[model samples]
Target chain A: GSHMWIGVISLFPEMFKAITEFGVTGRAVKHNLLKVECWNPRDFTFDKHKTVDDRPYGGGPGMLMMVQPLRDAIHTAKAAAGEGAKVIYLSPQGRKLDQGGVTELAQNQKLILVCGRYEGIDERLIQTEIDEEWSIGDYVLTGGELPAMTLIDAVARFIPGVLGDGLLDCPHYTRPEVLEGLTVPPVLMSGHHEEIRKWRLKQSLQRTWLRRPELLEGLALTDEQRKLLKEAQAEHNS
Target chain B: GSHMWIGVISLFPEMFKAITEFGVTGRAVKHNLLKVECWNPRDFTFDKHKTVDDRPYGGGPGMLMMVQPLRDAIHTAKAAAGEGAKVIYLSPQGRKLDQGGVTELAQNQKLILVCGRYEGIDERLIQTEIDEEWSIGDYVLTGGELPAMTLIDAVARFIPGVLGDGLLDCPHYTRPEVLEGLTVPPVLMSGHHEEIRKWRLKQSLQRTWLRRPELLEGLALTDEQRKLLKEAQAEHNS
Candidate 1:
């Protein structure tokens, strides 16, 4: 299939509905450019209570997800996705996920995202079945669902995308052009193609410089970019 | 109301349903610990197409979200949230959001999140109306919804609640005592309360060291922590 499939192993399958049923992600799903599926560990449980977690071996504040059901769910997704499919467990112990990582994952045909809840999944499961672990940032959330959704959002945009184009972009504008005393840049409305392009590029660089200078690192700049950037800085400070 | 309020301005407001209606976030909403509202920019549009986006002035591959509706929507959110309410725009150019940042925002009574779609939002709108811009990571997505959701996920988790008990926690486990040769750390089950506490703390530090060492910078460590970290380092080497 030409589709990019993301199979998630989670306890809360209902949570996955948001991405599949709405927004850009939903549109991608509808267009068949991206595919998302949730495999609930709860469904794999055979016990009367269908329980999937137990106390940590060393004892902790909360229970850890049991290994068996999760392991089985991973197998199920892998069997469907293919034997070569890579499994990513969303965990605080994983490498930080960023644009670069999203770009790498977007190139893949299939990804099985294992989302853990409670204290965490058993160490054995992570060590044995998971190919990689990822954390969205240094922050912790109630579960891996949001990070997974975040990944889906980032990855999907890149896949069905206008292809290459280096993706990250600049400011937008719509009607009235002026509102509450704030006006769209005069250059944008000037109808000078070359000038507008340069202005947008400068704004992009200026934004990265003013707000996220760290990102500016390693992004090689052209001479014109350098010249425009200085002007943007002057304008901002002035 | 003594509760925290998160007002969002977006094109796809229904995307927020799950966060407001389900699971932990739902519990918070129910307990009145948190409140969430969505304001659609499209609703503020007057003409038939209810146009909220327009062709980029100098010409581009995609359309840009316009200025009017977005600016008006921000004012509405601020008006209802409070006079002192701050607006955050989710953008790749903004500061990376993390636990510390989330902690700071969690202390606030109100936050208005502006979600931009199309190529981007008008620069003037952001420069004048937004107090800050946030990025979940160094990545770009089709819309700001995920970043907004990510912000909610991290920020909502901190409402004193769930704050510094360091609630979003470590690998935990329960029952099945032994799963195919993996044993629970004996101390956890040994009923040594003090020892279990130390071990859990050590695991947290060890996990941080093994995975996100960059996060440990400037985090003051005790002599005992140094020893534990040293032990963890040795084990990794072995």
Candidate 2:
């Protein structure tokens, strides 16, 4: 019943269109479940060139976004985003994001995200203005736009009704499931809801175990989970 | 003179519009540096409902994308992309993507990215069809579209003319360098080209060390880089 307010600061205004106009995000916007807004540093610039970046004070290969435009853009985002919004700079230097963080952010009423470009943003601005920093991964990208979108997509998913059926990512199948000699396990089509539900949980845990084992460390498992996992590990050795 | 070919298989073909239609990627396409083509699994489904997903066998919370449509779409993408294209399934279970992986992928003449939805694609499909799996980070997304676009963006940047001027992201500046008591580093404005180059490399190394030390583990440092990093570490320690 509540809507999340997301604010972004960046030079490229067009990038937000992807989230605002399409897929799950688009539905969220149309239904008023969430809102995303952008503040471009370029909009804050007042010179003939309307410049938003400058030379790094200590020298560097790429340009760091200038203090003025970024600072101005950040203030603009804060004022519009409402109070209690945390201002985050998306960067490789920040803390890595995890599912728990996404769930935490999903509960928040407001989030203001800053997307830095070029070599980086001014250090002083980051020190004085930003509340924290968040990174999507260990790798670097040309800018923080993709990271911003990633944050928006991940954080928004935790909201109920955002995924249509309020469904968690369960395994999906289509008809005549046999493909290239691989057959679908028969339990799914048995029409027994309770058994199907257990199977789903089992697979979800096992899948996470098979791939992202570290994630399971933070998760609390049931006796069923422990038993399923014990049996699951045996097949994995093959 | 060569244009890279990128192939994608997804249920939401409309999602690929983010890269195919915007910013640096738009320029990449306009200049003939790369091409992105999408094939929807919905089109490949044989049933009247055009079913691309169904209940998972052994039961689960979310749907795993069925084997048939995904497999068919993968085949479709590979055929159009031509031989020697890598079929990468975007999943949390895969190897983490890094700059080195992006560079390695860019070297290929073609790439076929498989996007999965719900719990994920059936393990059978992965076992039979995929060449590799790439996880952008430790987190999970609702689907693989963002990862696809990220790969396209990062990989495209490495191509010869993706970023104009063939510039290796040098630090940038605009007018009125002094702001909030912070001035542009003097070395950048000294007209010392060689010194400027060194400063650039130094800052790049320093920033990487400060933020993504993991990335630095792979890079062999130069004498200048080592000295700059030492100085950088001291200032950072404060």
Candidate 3:
């Protein structure tokens, strides 16, 4: 099996070990179906202390990651990837990740993910060298490590032969079926595949609609999808 | 110094280990400032093979995590956390996490986080045992591990003495700050304390307003904050 390669540039390289423990992402790495490498920008620093960050040129509240070391590290990782590989910076301001983005990334042979920390990286490097910027969502995180892992996990799900059943993992559920007087919808246990499919789609649609309607504007829904959504909304209203 | 303990209940214990490596959260763990304990629901299974899930009583698409075993696991984790611990279940249906929630959780002595997998857990257990349900936003992932970590990292920032500086991290500036035909705001480099403070407030308000206006609805803004926001919006229009 051809393996998918993902390279991460982070200050805390040991953090990548978290992705190798269990679940689908872990299993993929354990089986050698996916290869992940971590690069520390500090390693490329020329300073005696191997510092990766310095004061901003005009002065700022926090230290800015030095551009030269990061640039050097990215180039090294890109070179190590060999041939075609997409290099992406995970940031809060980038285009949001969605099912389509995940699917598209799954087709890539290699990816170099750069995780920025402590203020941010120098803009000069991003403009001149980075291929793309991808954001998990609008929220702020301490760094890009988790978002990078998120991209890897979501994208890997679309990889052929990754999931055992050729189906996306089933929707998760939790206790009481009805607790605090709220019960699990009867449709969940109706044992009707058609009804279950409709229920799942409704939940997925409503979840996205309430939380991230922006995502829906970009999605191309089929006639059946539009009808299902209408029916779901109608059912809710009644 | 008193430590903030975290009890993680998951089927995959190793997953929790992977979380303690070397990122922002990892640094907290390394300094003995934070403690994490893993409780596997399988440990409480009565079956010879240690089964933690069962077929849905009325039939469903996927198996539901058995109530007793999970409930027992939660109990055990709670016991390990001692008194004054808040129990949280990571679920999609729960209240969305925001900066305010993170601040609230930081005041607690301990947090018992339950990570659900499979179709879901038995609802009965959740109703009777859990304290709160939390969602890390609107997106869905394969499991609750990342959300759990996200919760921990965000909350940790609010912990006094956890970070070297008491200040919230400096704001981030991205590319075009001059490159790609974009420019950094001149106020950022003005080196005037009063003006810089006003600029930051305006930037924060404007950025949040543009990207996440819902957050500002009930936010109590200072008079300075109000003025900055108005000016920023006016600048945008002009």
Candidate 4:
């Protein structure tokens, strides 16, 4: 019995397999911790051609996803997902996604993600049917399927037992101990639990600082972290 | 005759089908505009067990991807991709990916994307083998497959003839005109070409401002865009 249910509405429903069949998200699905269902707006169409899009009214290079079919699909997804399921539209014009946002979204018991293709969907449908809009980053993609998968993969990590850690992970090494003239960091092989923890903590801090300094902004650090970071910085400079 | 070649080294190389066999990326692959080759680290292993990872030296919850197999895979990937293919590792502790970055990466004639699994690849492997590191966002996922796919999808858009545009596109509408008490914006149906262009540009500006204001920051706006944003801002406030 899955505790979290997710409904995805997209033209390319098959893309969901990338997450449902592999790695941690796959394992989560297999263990029944999460449930994912794909719905195609085309399925809601009544026409002979089952038209899901049409030429833009304002004249664009690509078609706009039609209103009726998508709206119907949203209603169906919502119905299937049960109570309090939020309708989300994956678009470039949405709030930027981050880990904090993923943690908050993971709290929801149900979610129906709308993946738009072509130029985009009718603004009216988004205004009327969607509860929120989320974007993975600043770049544009051909369709929303990838972003939807990304959101699902990210949110799945916060689902209890999905992943073991949320912080910037420290470096790791394995057997052979020495390879290509490189040895495992001495502290890691020292067999001192306290020393190992401290070493890992400092490395995580140093790595984060070296790569993503913005992450450290407004982050409260203990006296130990401050000292550790200072030592790492000195070593880096030297 | 592919102009851009991409080599992916991952434990779960099959996950790439989500990109290579679908949508725009699929079309690109079919048309031979883009060439993607998946190399599994497991293939490089020599032992009877074909081991690719082992227990972390510091005693962590998960295994650490080994150095030898990955390094061997990188060399093989490099050899196949031809010259000047920068090796990129997808990790959380890397430069934040964005449209500008995507554009820059698209300029490359060849790329070898390293998708780390488990805890992560050994630090020495990353230090010696990878030319650059990239992150899709702040959140962590089960593996780099999704981020690698995200990067490819985003970068593919920049490839000539992939899709039509790169901007935050304006809203679009189509046939039936009216549905669920919503009509296509009257101006879109006005049949005035100049008016439509102005309307679309203004809408693009307004939409970007409303959803992703940071995109507008430091962006040099045309006189027309400035006035349009001002008009949109006043209307928004009212």
Candidate 5:
């Protein structure tokens, strides 16, 4: 499979090094499965001051990012990423992203991620340049760099060979079988393959139900999964 | 005001510099409005190898974070963070976080953020040591460092004096108002404060309704806001 290429346009492009240089995402980059390029809007400016932001026309308290630099940066990124690249602005005023969105985004061969800062970028820039807007969640942050990084980290997991499994994980325990008095789940150590598989699946379902029931609502469970969830629910309620 | 202190427990503590050393969050740190201390689980291990993860008892495809080092790290964080600090484990199983949660979290004078790795930390560690679990969104990432940084950035915005305003921002435009053919909203250049205020409020309401209607659902709107929103909607639909 061809590697995913992402062009990140931000004032603080160095922030992305946190993900591009470390962890599984870093490993993906090292293995040539993912490629990332950073573009700074400031670099696209023409004036000596290289100004990228100005007072809002409507007289807002904070500065707004000017359009020219950002638009030019997007143009450069699009040129490098190919005309097919989708330009996405990370903003609070965007569709909420989830695992499904992450999976869909992984299908894109090239992406241009625009990170806005200060009050926000010019509305016309968003309307004219962006193909889509995506928000990690409803919370507000200082800037979109973190959100962009969050999106990248999550979407990378969906790339083929990036992860071992796609399921919501079950509870995990490691060595010192007994800590204080808490012991590893006996079923895990039972040395019975069939029983262990069933136990893990049931626990995963139960954990999903207990923590994020909304996730389970979207799945088409098999009879075995339904029965296991039912049994786990009954035991929990009891 | 007393500075907000955060104790971050993670395998990759350096990743947090993305937030702590740059942007508004960085300024908060430099100004002494926020103090962050990193605690690495590897440092808490007793063995020469400083082992922090091991094979899962349930024979999973990936490793599980061992209980000892994580528990010890949390204990050390709690000591530095004071007795009132909340120990939060960043996990997919945690309550979904939003702006409201960020506000509530900022109320704490101190916080201990634990970033789990591999498959996950031992469930017993969560039940015993963690005061709360928080997930940034439904998607999975390589680890919790990004989520921890995300939470810090969002929560920091709520810290008193950290930001100028708490409201969702209105659209903004800067100089060279006419770009290509796109012009700045005429109302902005009208210089009528009352009209500008009203237009800005209406645009904010319309933008929220168009992109994140759920946020409006949580708000109690005034007659002015409702009327403005209705007008905006009518114009949009027309």
Candidate 6:
């Protein structure tokens, strides 16, 4: 199997080791299914102080990551990524990542994920060098490292043969066949494939619609999906 | 100062060590501001193989996490959490978490977080034992650990003195102040606090409105906030 290369640009180099060691993600890297590497922007700093952040040039709260070091690190990482790779900087202003986006990323052979810290990186670098901007959600965080991990995990799953079964993950259940006295939906235990598929689809659609309706906006839906969604909404409203 | 306790229930207990060892979260723990403990559901397994999953009761593609083991773990973790703690499970079906939710969690003395693998936890357990469900975003991943970290990081910021200043984090900027020759808005560098605050508010409102408008639905908006949002939207539309 071909290796999927992921390079992370972060201030904390040690953080990568923690994520690379467990669960499906760890398993993938361990088995040579994925190659995860790190490039610290601090490594490229040349000042005697080796400072990576500075007061904003125009004047603002918090520090801005100096442009030169990050740019240099990005260039080095890109070069390492070889050709035909996309450079993405994690930011709130970036496009929201969803399952479809994950699927797209899974097809790429190389991905250079730049994690921004402080106020952010120098604007000039992202405009010129970065191929894409991916955000995990609307909220802000201290840095981009977590979002980078999220993108990697979501995208990696779409890689063929990474998961034991080609099928998307099955729906999960927790304790108490009945919780708070609410019983598990009988369909879940019916042992009927068609009914189970319908139940899962309905649950997915209903769950997404209730929790993140924006996700449904551009999704292509079949008649069954549309009907299920309408029924689900009605059920929710009632 | 009291300790902030976090309990994680997962199949992989080793993963918690990785999370507790480094980065912003680790810094919090090191400062005695935060503490994390793990509960492995597998330990509750009784069968010869210590099985924590089973064939779907009804019939499904993937295994379902057994109810008994997880419930017992949740109970154990809650007991260990002592008093004044909340139990939160990571789930796609849960309430969407944001800056506000993180702020709320930080005020609490303890939190019990459950991380489910495979298809998902049984809804019955969630309905009864879990206090709430929290999702980082709309996307799905192989597991809930990443979201768990995201929750931790975001919540850590609100821990009174975790950050140097009590002020909320400043906005970030990325490389290339100029994108395709379009420069970052001049206001960022203008050195005007009033204007900077207004710009920040406008940017925050605009960004949130554009990407996650649903968040705005229940938010309590002051007159200034409402005006800024309208102006920002108009500016973007224009």
Select the stronger candidate by DockQ from 1 and 2: 1
Question: Which residue runs of candidate 2 sit more than 4 Å off their true CA positions?
Answer: A48-61, A64-67, A164-174, A186-238, B45-50, B66-69, B164-177, B183-238
Q: How high is each candidate's TM-score?
A: 0.90, 0.83, 0.77, 0.94, 0.95, 0.82
Q: Is the docking of candidate 6 incorrect, acceptable, medium or high quality?
A: acceptable
- Summed backbone clashes in each candidate are 13, 25, 13, 0, 0, 26
Best by lDDT: 5
What DockQ results for candidate 3? 0.25
Q: lDDT of each structure?
A: 0.78, 0.76, 0.72, 0.85, 0.86, 0.76
- Grade the docking of candidate 5: medium
DockQ numbers for every candidate? 0.59, 0.35, 0.25, 0.70, 0.75, 0.38
The regions of model 1 sitting more than 4 angstroms off are A161-169, A223-238, B160-173, B234-238
Question: Chain A TM-scores, all candidates?
Answer: 0.91, 0.90, 0.81, 0.93, 0.93, 0.84
The C-alpha stretches of model 3 lying farther than 4 A from their native spots are: A1-3, A82-84, A96-109, A137-139, A165-238, B46-48, B56-61, B165-238
State residue B168's C-alpha deviation in candidate 2, in Å.
16
Tens-place lDDT per residue, model 1, A78-160, is 99998657899887667878778888887888899998876678776776788988888777777888788888888887774
Sorted on DockQ, best first, the list reads 5, 4, 1, 6, 2, 3
Candidate 2 lDDT, A115-161, residue by residue in tens: 88776776667666889888887666777888899889898787778
Q: TM-score of model 2 relative to the true fold?
A: 0.83
**How well does candidate 3 score on lDDT at residue A135?**
77
By summed lDDT, the worst window of 10 consecutive residues in model 1 chain B runs over: B160-169
Question: Between candidates 4 and 6, which one is better according to TM-score?
Answer: 4
Tens digit of per-residue lDDT, candidate 3, span A135-215 = 765456677887887788777766555565111222444455665576767877777878777767766776556555665
Complex DockQ, candidate 4: 0.70
lDDT of 4 by residue, A18-105 (tens): 8898888888898888889998999999999999987888676778787788888988988887789998999878888988899888
Model 4 chain A poorest ten-residue lDDT run? A158-167
What is the Å distance of residue A60 in model 3 from its true position? 3.7
lDDT of 2: 0.76
| Candidate 5 C-alpha lDDT tens digits along A128-213 | 88989999988888899999999888888877776662346677777878876888889889888899899888888888888778
